[PDB]
Amino acid sequence: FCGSELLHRNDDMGPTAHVAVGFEGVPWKSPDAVTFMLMQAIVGSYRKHDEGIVPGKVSANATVRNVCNKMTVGCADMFSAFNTCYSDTGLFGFYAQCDEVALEHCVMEIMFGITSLSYAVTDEEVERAKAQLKTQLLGHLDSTTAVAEDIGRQMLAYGRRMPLAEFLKRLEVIDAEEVKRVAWKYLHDAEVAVAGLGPLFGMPQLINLRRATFWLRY
Amino acid sequence: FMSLFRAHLVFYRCALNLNSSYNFGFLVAMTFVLQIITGITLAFRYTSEASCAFASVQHLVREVAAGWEFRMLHATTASFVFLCILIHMTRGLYNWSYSYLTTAWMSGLVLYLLTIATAFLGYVLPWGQMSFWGATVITNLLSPIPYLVPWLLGGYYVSDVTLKRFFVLHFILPFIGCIIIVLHIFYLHLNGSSNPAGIDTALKVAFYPHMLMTDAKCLSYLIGLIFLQAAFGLMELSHPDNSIPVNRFVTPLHIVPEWYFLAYYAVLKVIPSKTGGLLVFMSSLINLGLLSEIRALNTRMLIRQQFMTRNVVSGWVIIWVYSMIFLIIIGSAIPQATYILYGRLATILYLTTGLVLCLY
Amino acid sequence: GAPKFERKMLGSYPVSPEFEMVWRDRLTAHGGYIQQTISPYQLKFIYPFWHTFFARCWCKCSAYAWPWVWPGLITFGLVKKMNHDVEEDIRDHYWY
Amino acid sequence: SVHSHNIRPDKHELPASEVPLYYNRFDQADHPSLWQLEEEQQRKHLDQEVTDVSQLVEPVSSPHQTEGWFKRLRYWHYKETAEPTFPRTPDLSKGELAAGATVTRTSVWHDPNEPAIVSVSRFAPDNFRAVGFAENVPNPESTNSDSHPDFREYRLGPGSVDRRPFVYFMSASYFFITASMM
Amino acid sequence: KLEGSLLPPPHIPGIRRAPREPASPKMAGMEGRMPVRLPPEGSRFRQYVDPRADVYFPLTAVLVTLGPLYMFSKAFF
Amino acid sequence: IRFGNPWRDDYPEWIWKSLRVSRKDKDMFAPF
Amino acid sequence: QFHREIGKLFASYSNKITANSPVQYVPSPPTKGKVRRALSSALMPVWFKFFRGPLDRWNLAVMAKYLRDHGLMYDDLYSDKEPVFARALELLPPDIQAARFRRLMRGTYLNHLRLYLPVHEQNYDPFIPYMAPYVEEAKFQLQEEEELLGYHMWEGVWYSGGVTGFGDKEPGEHFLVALPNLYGAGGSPMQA
Amino acid sequence: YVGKENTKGNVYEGIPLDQSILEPADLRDYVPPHSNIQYSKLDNGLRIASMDRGGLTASLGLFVHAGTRFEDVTNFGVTHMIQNLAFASTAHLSLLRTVKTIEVLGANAGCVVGREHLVYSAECLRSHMPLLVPMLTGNVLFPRFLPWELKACKEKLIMARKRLEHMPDQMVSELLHTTAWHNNTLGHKLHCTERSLGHYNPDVIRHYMLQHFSPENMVFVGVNVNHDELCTWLMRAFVDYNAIPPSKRTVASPVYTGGDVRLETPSPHAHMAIAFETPGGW
């Protein structure tokens, strides 16, 4: 896994900049895979256009809350985190869309987000994330196609299919200290890879994003 | 920096009913600027040597053109610095200004501490009997910690080294003052001043025409009075005993600090334990600091009206003022049992009426 | 300063720097009002002060009587009694 | 702003559903528009003549409220000590106030004869007004009292001199003394 | 008719009226002063209120709150 | 005693009258 | 494992507090112990007749006269530098709001002149509680926000966006974030 | 979470995901549930329907017969206002507490307006159903409609159409409707116009609700819940309170006008649609 950037600067495609940032993940079969599935949910997502019934400025998710209160106007059009596992390695990170002049905050807020997982996360947040993750995953598996896809995917990835009770039992026992252990194992003071497109005059340096992964406080 | 000048001192909008009692801040600032001018021009001819400091101050008066004028303006303007500061403090105790001007009140306290330090350092530089023995006393008072006192002195006793560093420190501190003044005003204009009525009102009026002229009027009065006292000597503000050269083995037979230090002196006369003495100052200053967050010490919603007009109960600030004046009186007198007895009565009043401000 | 619901402007023209303090303290005129002023070159300005002197002075002096003078009188009393005690001590202790 | 609030539980100061410091009698309307009518049907104390201080109406609220060591001020209204989970129920028969917590965490607004959506509508804070409100609350017409002098008795009218020379002479005089001293 | 600064309310349909206090007999000592009400008729305070004491209070305050301190001081300091 | 007394304070009638006096459309220093 | 053990301590204590919860209103325990209640009850006849009575009557006389001189009400003494009252004032209806504005104007002018009002202008009760229904609502609204948002010491980015990062939401209200610009014309937060 | 009682931590630490951790105690012999619809009714009029498929997440929904085809010249826009006020303050809960609780349970919830129906719904694990039935029924049983919430919620009435300016297909849908039934019933617009922001006061909302939101105009539907628990917790919701009383409303037949309309904008295609009426409808 190489830590590098690949930026396509272009000022003739309108005001919006697109970015993705990535970290090194873990394989399908790794013990910590589940914790990774949880961390992706702890950071979560946001859209300015369509929002449900909770205002972003009062949301229980602290990352969304911090983004939506920036300069009182809020600094992002959309952001969403992701985790992908392969046979022998993974990727973990986020994708974002934001305005030319908001890009810097747009990115560093979410990096602060992800770095919090290793220092200061608390069980209110962990349980909120568990609830949302369970809702999502257990909510997909309704139709025959979803079930068949899940059967085959797990058959290839694990050599078996993991029954629901096992997943729930392994998810239950993860607490804050466990998240704060795994993050400290893989994400604190790590290498990152970056890609972007559009009005990238605002864009931060690679070294900025890389020194963001640790806090000098504490 | 002109745009800021206009925003804060020309177009800034005040309340219509700001009377003279709100003009004394400007006044203390002006005494600061003036004291700085006279300071610098006194430094050009002062000698910082224990062997000859005294005669250095006498040379200005005797052999230099207008030599006498700068020394006497510098000496007399100090009293006005302190008088204006005390009026300025009491105004805000009276109004409960600290209810919402929290950080301004803290900054104020820091500025008052700076001013005490500056004055006392100045008081040693003419190098007479009172200067030497005052320095001895105050340095012995902060003795509790080993080696700190010979270190700060520079020496086993008050010395020429002590004079040199006191002179440099007295040079420097006023300007730190100025910086803290800018900080003070930042916190102030962040909030906005209070009324004498303690209400919120929309009947505001701009500064430049109306309030600037009142500032100027009071400024005229103050310049007047300073020159009156400086040129003719109406009041014996400073005791004569600093006119005698120093002797390291004989004290002066009667002792009276500068008036703005007498109350403190009174305490040192009447409390038996020396540490109790020092702790009274520390405690009273801590109590004043504590007023900055008085809104938190109770769950009843607070108002600024203290309803002291026509009130037979008076108010704790007035009792504080009268207790302090009584302490000045007793400060001035000789040590005798009866003076000490009424001293202790007044001291208890002074401490209690400060503690009680928090109990609304 | 002012609450955010008072310092919200109707206009949209940029506030110039020299007017900062002016619009940080904006307040609404609930109900509106009418005001009249005369140029100070067309007013008497030392007769209005003396014309209303007695009323103003009555008010000011009335307000301060109890709160400032009565404790003052008590303090003056205390000083006189202290002087008495001292002038008696000085004879008891040292005169035969 | 830089200022906090102080909503917290307190053991020296009971909550306002328990011990209100204000006089706890309020009238209630079915719709706040009705408050218009009373303003044009009541009498008012300021429409009627009195001449001596001893004739001024006496306050409704009692002098005897707040107690304790070294408390100068003996009368207050409002406090921010926090409410419990289950508040004390207002007794509307005695015209006690029902507001905020005591509407949300109490059965006070319930009526057997009426839909709930209709019943709750009467408990917004605009539907309550104290007793004595229409009779005592002032509403000025001007900042100036007709018993005091305004500019009309000081204005320099037709026939008057020009005063620019005098004004500018005054200020020039001030300045030339100032300059000599400087 | 009513105690305090209240006047009998008009009967307006749609407004619910709180009960209002009837007037009570005043005590001696309130002749010619700005009136300040007495406690309710069924309180414990109205057993011990005495308006005639408001005249001596300017002396009572000082005596009570400063005399004992003076006595203590003269005894021990 | 009305002076300084919260139970009775009010202006004397002669002070209330001093405020009714008028010098409108008069000026005695015009020659200067 | 230190942290989980102290967790256990906290959790058991919280469960004790939870188990004792009532399900309905129960009157508060008295504010004073039985000793002091006894002593006060004993000394009442002297203390209330000679000292507390006249103190509490003089106080209301002083307050009423000062408010009547100026034509204020009592609830005109509260500021809007107080968050709860700021909310209460936001919730006011037009007429009450306008009358309050007018009374404050007149009071400012009268305190400038230092002239009494005529006694026939002073015939009203100043102690009507006209702000109460709104203060109670403000208290409710501002309590729920503490419960649902303020229950932890949240972590932020320092000295970014014009705010220190330790909790402020209005730019440049603290000294270390003063002077936001060195060139240009500045700006105001309300026009973003 | 004031501390935590369990100290054992991650009890499956270091076990790969292709290695099982189930004990034989957690095995079962499968019994299907029965999945034909179950139908019930409360005494006040409310109809209840339920199914179970043994999924872990449930779907809950309340259906009200209050669309926009029931408005008039004095009402236009009221249904949109009600939908834009869903999950606002009610008798026993505030807006903030309601939405924050729905967030922290993990659920997703919302409200939808049509031309003939209004729908509220929620979704999360089935074990949370007792906590969700109140919050859904609240909105129709006793909302407060405090003015300062109406005022703060206003801009969402305009954004709803401001976004339609970059959804040509939906735009053409609305054009078809307003041209087919000109100025009546199904013809009415699904949004608040500028003329619709006048009558945005609580009395009009409340008076409209009193005519439609009675129980016999409602249905409550649940999927993946046990029917006797659903019936129990629904009955326990209406037992203390008076619901909105019934009304014998009447509905007018739509009048189909037809006609023609054009709307130009820089789109690079000619979008066209032609339509005829279906007599009688559903």
Ligand SMILES: CCCCCCCCCCCCCCCCCC(=O)OC[C@H](COP(=O)([O-])OCC(O)COP(=O)([O-])OC[C@@H](COC(=O)CCCCCCCCCCCCCCCCC)OC(=O)CCCCCCCCCCCCCCCCC)OC(=O)CCCCCCCCCCCCCCCCC
């Ligand atoms: C003549 C006098 C001259 C005085 C000169 C003083 C110069 C000091 C400068 C201070 C440092 C810069 C501050 C800028 C912070 C920017 C704000 C911000 O967002 O920061 C976030 C950042 C927190 O990090 P984060 O947000 O978690 O994320 C970080 C990123 O992930 C990753 O980080 P990043 O990549 O974003 O970079 C962050 C960077 C930001 O900076 C930059 O980007 C630019 C570079 C900064 C300036 C570098 C030049 C400064 C030169 C240092 C040496 C000065 C010596 C002076 C001695 C005078 C001798 C006469 O901050 C730093 O790393 C600064 C580290 C150095 C400061 C710590 C020094 C304290 C050591 C105390 C040891 C005990 C000694 C006791 C004995 C007495 C000694 C006198 O804040 C900091 O940590 C900054 C420092 C905080 C101050 C700590 C307390 C200081 C007090 C020390 C004790 C005082 C002793 C006095 C007693 C005397 C006894 C007699």
Ligand SMILES: CCCCCCCCCCCCCCCCCC(=O)OC[C@H](COP(=O)([O-])OCC(O)COP(=O)([O-])OC[C@@H](COC(=O)CCCCCCCCCCCCCCCCC)OC(=O)CCCCCCCCCCCCCCCCC)OC(=O)CCCCCCCCCCCCCCCCC
């Ligand atoms: C007149 C006052 C002067 C004050 C001076 C202060 C000292 C300044 C020292 C530093 C120098 C600064 C210079 C500027 C001073 C200010 C100038 C100014 O603008 O004054 C405005 C001043 C008052 O203006 P305002 O707008 O009413 O002010 C608002 C009020 O303060 C009302 O404000 P509020 O209502 O908002 O209240 C807020 C509150 C805020 O609280 C405060 O501000 C309280 C501050 C208290 C002081 C706390 C600190 C004390 C620290 C200790 C100091 C110890 C010093 C020891 C000195 C010992 C000296 C022996 O203030 C108060 O409560 C103040 C009321 C206090 C009442 C006390 C009543 C005492 C009665 C005593 C009766 C004595 C009877 C004796 C009978 C004897 C019989 C034998 O008006 C004038 O001065 C008018 C001009 C008069 C010119 C007359 C010239 C006549 C010349 C005649 C020549 C004759 C020649 C004959 C030749 C003949 C040839 C044949």
Ligand SMILES: CCCCCCCCCCCCCCCCCC(=O)OC[C@H](COP(=O)([O-])OCC(O)COP(=O)([O-])OC[C@@H](COC(=O)CCCCCCCCCCCCCCCCC)OC(=O)CCCCCCCCCCCCCCCCC)OC(=O)CCCCCCCCCCCCCCCCC
């Ligand atoms: C080896 C030798 C050993 C010798 C040992 C000798 C030991 C002697 C110890 C003597 C102790 C005396 C105090 C006993 C207290 C008993 C308390 C009790 O039973 O409580 C039950 C019970 C407690 O229940 P509670 O629920 O707290 O109810 C009470 C309320 O909270 C109350 O609140 P409320 O709202 O009902 O009432 C209104 C409230 C609020 O009232 C106000 O705020 C009004 C304020 C008006 C002020 C107006 C001032 C105007 C004039 C100013 C003049 C200028 C002065 C400044 C300038 C001067 C120059 C410097 O009133 C107060 O706060 C009253 C404050 C009274 C302070 C009295 C201080 C006496 C000090 C004696 C010396 C102690 C040692 C000193 C230190 C020594 C060194 C460490 O309280 C009562 O029933 C009330 C009792 C009140 C009694 C007060 C009068 C006591 C008279 C004692 C005479 C002692 C003579 C000693 C002679 C010694 C000769 C050798």
Ligand SMILES: CCCCCCCCCCCCCCCCCC(=O)OC[C@H](COP(=O)([O-])OCC(O)COP(=O)([O-])OC[C@@H](COC(=O)CCCCCCCCCCCCCCCCC)OC(=O)CCCCCCCCCCCCCCCCC)OC(=O)CCCCCCCCCCCCCCCCC
């Ligand atoms: C120029 C500055 C340089 C630029 C960079 C900035 C430098 C600052 C870095 C130091 C801060 C580290 C601590 C991080 C805390 C993070 C907590 C968090 O999540 O944030 C949210 C949290 C606020 O959120 P919230 O809870 O919603 O707000 C509600 C209130 O907090 C009300 O909450 P409550 O009422 O519920 O009570 C809560 C309270 C409950 O606890 C208490 O109240 C305990 C009271 C017990 C009394 C004992 C004193 C406690 C204070 C300890 C002070 C020791 C530190 C100094 C050690 C000296 C070593 C030489 O909680 C605490 O006190 C916990 C925090 C206490 C930490 C304070 C000390 C941290 C300093 C550590 C490094 C020391 C090295 C310094 C080297 C020498 C130079 C200074 O943040 C804080 O509370 C801030 C705490 C830290 C103080 C602010 C930092 C100072 C910034 C201004 C600079 C002033 C410099 C002046 C020099 C100028 C030179 C020309």
Ligand SMILES: CCCCCCCCCCCCCCCCCC(=O)OC[C@H](COP(=O)([O-])OCC[N+](C)(C)C)OC(=O)CCCCCCCCCCCCCCCCC
């Ligand atoms: C830039 C540094 C300047 C230093 C000044 C020292 C100069 C030498 C000594 C004084 C010489 C005489 C004064 C100059 C002549 C007058 C100026 C002029 O043309 O008038 C313009 C005008 C004159 O206005 P006018 O209305 O009188 O007349 C002009 C109109 N016509 C021409 C039609 C007549 O002056 C002003 O309006 C000034 C407004 C302020 C007035 C009050 C000031 C009093 C002081 C306030 C507090 C001071 C503390 C602050 C200082 C900080 C340090 C402590």
Ligand code: HEM
């Ligand atoms: C707020 C500002 C100041 C205050 C309150 C202050 C106070 C004093 C005091 C009380 C004295 C005693 C004079 C005497 O006893 O005769 C003094 C003397 C002196 N001050 Fe300051 N001072 C201030 C600023 C300055 C400054 C800025 C300087 C120089 C830069 C300075 C230099 C001196 C000198 C040289 C003396 C010696 C006077 C002599 O020997 O006769 N002062 N000061």
Ligand code: HEM
């Ligand atoms: C060198 C010392 C000081 C200077 C130069 C200074 C200057 C000023 C100025 C110019 C003002 C505004 C105008 C005025 O109030 O006159 C002010 C206000 C104020 N000052 Fe000071 N001050 C000093 C000391 C103090 C002290 C010692 C305190 C408190 C112990 C203090 C507390 C306050 C407060 C509370 C206000 C505002 C009061 C209100 O708005 O109601 N200041 N100061």
Ligand SMILES: COc1cc2[nH]c(C)c(-c3ccc(Oc4ccc(OC(F)(F)F)cc4)cc3)c(=O)c2cc1Cl
């Ligand atoms: C009667 O009522 C009032 C009188 C008032 N008088 C004055 C003089 C001011 C004032 C002071 C300083 C300032 O800006 C400055 C800060 C610091 C400096 O530095 C130093 F050291 F002073 F020179 C200079 C300049 C801006 C404004 C007030 O606000 C003010 C407010 C009220 Cl209500």
Ligand SMILES: O=C1C(O)=C([C@H]2CC[C@H](c3ccc(Cl)cc3)CC2)C(=O)c2ccccc21
């Ligand atoms: O005995 C003393 C004495 O007690 C002080 C004292 C006065 C108060 C001073 C002081 C006390 C507290 C503070 Cl915060 C500041 C100054 C310290 C010196 C003198 O100033 C003095 C001068 C000359 C000879 C003897 C003496």
